[PDB]
């Protein structure tokens, strides 16, 4: 009676088209629990290596034993939060109210933005505080950029600007915490937000594969047996039934595959350090040498080497945090071989 089979590919990551921004944009942020703090960071993908680790999990029979774990090295230098945007609760959702900028700007920020020459940080701050008194303040987020100049392997000097939410205690205290970061010069590190052993959500724009067929793009079968020799090898059986007399958008067709934004959940941060400890011999293939602030993410991370990946504390963790894993060995072996 012709067997059942789940459909080819997911209908939840659509439409499968080229991403608008290469810089990922989070659609969700964590809950306001503890102390005030920025709800995310960002870095550049370097490559992969393996690490030998001591099993942290109290429920595993292998607790205390040596375990090899795959790791994606991501260079995470200090970023600069140049402003504080505030949102107001309107009957049409959340709309931006005002922004509080600075005086101290990075030498090459004028490659992307039209840097502020004349701004009033006090009138903006006053408008935000009047809104809080009125009970109209939505959420508080920071306009943040990266310093690609600090990373020698990434060719670009032009900063990657992104907005990041501040969550925490009361709305009064986090407004003050946000202003304190900005007023200095905006400099903050991975250490300020993340601790090794916590679960992070990494977002990234995938490796672009251009146009590919239904077999690669949707995971459909190739024509089997005799059918594979008739002139049709990698084409689907039919575009649909007689009725409805149209092709449904749910049928697996050709098109753009890759270069899509993905938000990969519950990625463990194995180690956050600085220096050249995770660098591979001969350099990372198609990237270069690492000698500076880094992060070691458990397993795979979306996007190719040199691409900007975004970090955010896990919005939906399954496991409890087992802080600072004992890193017995980090491989430095050549990736060429």
């Amino acid at each position: 009676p012709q067997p059942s089979r789940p459909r080819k590919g997911s209908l939840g990551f659509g439409p499968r088209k080229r991403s608008t921004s290469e810089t990922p944009r989070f659609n969700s942020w964590p809950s306001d629990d503890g102390q005030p703090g920025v709800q995310g960071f960002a870095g550049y993908k370097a490559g992969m290596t393996h690490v030998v680790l001591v099993n942290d999990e109290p429920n595993s029979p292998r607790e205390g034993m040596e375990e090899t774990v795959p790791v994606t090295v991501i260079e995470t230098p200090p970023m600069r939060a140049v402003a504080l945007r505030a949102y107001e609760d309107t009957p049409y959702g959340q709309r931006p109210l005002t922004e509080v900028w600075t005086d101290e700007f990075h030498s090459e920020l004028d490659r992307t933005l039209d840097v502020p020459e004349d701004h009033d940080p006090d009138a903006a701050e006053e408008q935000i505080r009047d809104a809080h008194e009125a009970g109209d303040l939505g959420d508080l987020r920071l306009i943040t950029h990266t310093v690609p100049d600090a990373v020698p392997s990434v060719p670009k000097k032009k900063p990657d600007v992104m907005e990041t939410r501040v969550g925490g205690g009361s709305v009064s205290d986090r407004l003050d915490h946000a202003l304190d970061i900005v007023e200095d010069g905006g400099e903050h590190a991975m250490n300020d937000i993340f601790r090794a052993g916590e679960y992070a959500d990494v977002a990234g724009v995938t490796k672009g594969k251009g146009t590919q067929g239904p077999v690669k793009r949707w995971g459909v079968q190739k024509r089997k047996g005799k059918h594979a020799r008739q002139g049709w090898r990698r084409r689907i059986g039919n575009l649909g039934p007689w009725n409805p007399s149209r092709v449904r958008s749910t049928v697996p067709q050709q098109g753009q595959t890759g270069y899509h934004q993905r938000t990969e959940l519950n990625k463990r941060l194995i180690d956050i350090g600085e220096g050249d400890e995770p660098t591979v011999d001969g350099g990372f293939v198609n990237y270069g040498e690492v000698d500076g602030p880094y992060t070691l993410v458990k397993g795979s991370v979306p996007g190719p080497d040199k691409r900007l990946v975004r970090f955010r504390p896990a919005v939906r963790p399954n496991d409890q945090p087992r802080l600072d894993p004992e890193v017995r060995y980090v491989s430095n072996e050549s990736n060429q071989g």
Partner: protein, 53 residues
């Protein structure tokens, strides 16, 4: 550990262990060493190998 074929140190979290019919065990560092062994070649006869030099 050390490669039972060439003699170089097997990088941890890498390699393959071949279990022979009699129960004997052979740790290999790479595919190159496995393939040379399958050709009936003995490690000490090949100049690139650490056992030979």
């Amino acid at each position: 550990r050390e490669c039972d074929y060439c003699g170089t140190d097997i990088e941890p979290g890498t390699g393959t262990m071949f279990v022979h019919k009699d129960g004997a065990t052979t740790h290999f560092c790479s595919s190159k060493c496995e393939n040379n062994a399958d050709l009936g070649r003995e490690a000490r006869n090949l100049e690139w190998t650490d056992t030979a030099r």
